[PDB]
Amino acid sequence: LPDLKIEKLDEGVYVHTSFEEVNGWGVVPKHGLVVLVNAEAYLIDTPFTAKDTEKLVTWFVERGYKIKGSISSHFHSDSTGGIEWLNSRSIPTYASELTNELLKKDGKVQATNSFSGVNYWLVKNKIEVFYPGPGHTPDNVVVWLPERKILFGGCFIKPYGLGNLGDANIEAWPKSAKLLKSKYGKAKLVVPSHSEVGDASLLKLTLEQAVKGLNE
Ligand SMILES: [Zn+2]
Ligand SMILES: [Zn+2]
């Protein structure tokens, strides 16, 4: 029910927030980013819906910021809902190969661009994608903005609770979170999907939450 929001987080970096009713969670927020590169926009995750995806695209396009592409952090609809809409307007969509395979098994439209392997530059020296290992889902990836020191951790970053465990790898998550912590300890900001922007400390809190969750 709450409207899409778009707020400036840093130079060239915006957080978009969209909202869905999920059984047994109530209203769930979903943060993505929009990164400006040379005055063009990259979507980091789509909103849940084609409607919120249209609104996000229009906000940037009306202000003279052409959409250059989207990258989806994992296969769940809170990352991928707007792929179909983006494809219908010939905006390049990006996902890992495993994210595309899971999208296809789940009867969902796929990104027109895939990458495999651990590191992938969406835009070299500006938008990097890292796979830390399975956690929230087998396919979850994070997006690093080296220039700003900003990690989009997506649905992997779970600083107060692990959320929906439906597709989770509870065995692997702590090791993944271990690896993520070592690599991005130098993060100025960490943006999770389902709770508010924080600092590097969100890496620790997620490790602790993973260790804790595995213990049961
Ligand atoms: Zn998810
Ligand atoms: Zn999520």
Numbering used by the authors: 4 to 219
Manuscript excerpt for this entry:
IMP-type metallo-β-lactamases confer resistance to carbapenems and a broad spectrum of β-lactam antibiotics. IMP-6 and IMP-1 differ by only a point mutation: Ser262 in IMP-1 and Gly262 in IMP-6. The overall structures of IMP-6 and IMP-1 are similar.
Here, we report the crystal structures of IMP-6 and IMP-1 with the same space group and similar cell constants at resolutions of 1.70 and 1.94 Å, respectively. The kcat/Km values of IMP-1 for imipenem and meropenem are nearly identical; however, for IMP-6, the kcat/Km for meropenem is 7-fold that for imipenem. However, the loop region (residues 60–66), which participates in substrate binding, is more flexible in IMP-6 than in IMP-1. This difference in flexibility determines the substrate specificity of IMP-type metallo-β-lactamases for imipenem and meropenem. The amino acid at position 262 alters the mobility of His263; this affects the flexibility of the loop via a hydrogen bond with Pro68, which plays the role of a hinge in IMP-type metallo-β-lactamases.
